[PDB]
Design a protein around this ligand. Structure first.
Ligand code: HEM
Ligand SMILES: c1ccc2cnccc2c1
Length: 153
């Protein structure tokens, strides 16, 4: 795909529907992360120590909202420029993920939760095109992050 204007339109659309209920969708997103990889709980500063995932926690909501925002912006960048660019922000993001003990093998985990989160957010308007645009947007932005990471350690 490498994002055609229509895949990019489709990603932009599901992102607003994402963004129309942050508390819900972001709580659902974390539930999904833990179901895939239980042990991932521990790397989150606002998850460990708890039973279940808080529903009205401000840091959780801002951090998961921002994750999704980054992937949607990569998707527009891929369409428009043809590449994902490495700017300050993403290099900062590399150092911070090395800090928190993130590895390359973790990235799949957060991809599948994002895929599944979007499937439930769009409900009947889910297509394979949507699934492939988001796959692509995620995989290109994680290649860039994976790079800054190995440059911070
Ligand atoms: C392209 C995929 C990813 C994106 C866009 C992303 C983005 C972010 C952002 C925006 C933050 C917080 C920004 C800030 O407040 O400075 C962050 C922190 C964090 N990320 Fe990610 N990340 C990605 C992959 C992952 C993966 C694979 C994991 C592993 C579970 C992960 C775990 C973490 C942790 C543990 C923190 C902070 C820890 C804490 O709150 O205790 N990230 N990431
Ligand atoms: C909150 C903060 C950081 C994250 C990074 N990757 C996946 C999920 C996240 C949620």
């Amino acid at each position: 795909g490498a994002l055609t204007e229509s895949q990019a339109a489709l990603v932009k659309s599901s992102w607003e529907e994402f963004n129309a209920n942050i508390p819900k969708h972001t709580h659902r997103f974390f539930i999904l992360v833990l179901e895939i990889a239980p042990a991932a709980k521990d790397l989150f500063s606002f998850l460990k120590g708890t039973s279940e995932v808080p529903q009205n926690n401000p840091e959780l909501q801002a951090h998961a909202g921002k994750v999704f925002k980054l992937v949607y912006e990569a998707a527009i960048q891929l369409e428009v420029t043809g590449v994902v660019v490495t700017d300050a922000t993403l290099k900062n993001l590399g150092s911070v993920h090395v800090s928190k003990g993130v590895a390359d093998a973790h990235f799949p985990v957060v991809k599948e939760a994002i895929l599944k989160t979007i499937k439930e957010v769009v409900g009947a308007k889910w297509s394979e095109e949507l699934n492939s645009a988001w796959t692509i947007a995620y995989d290109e932005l994680a290649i860039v992050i994976k790079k800054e990471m190995d440059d911070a350690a």
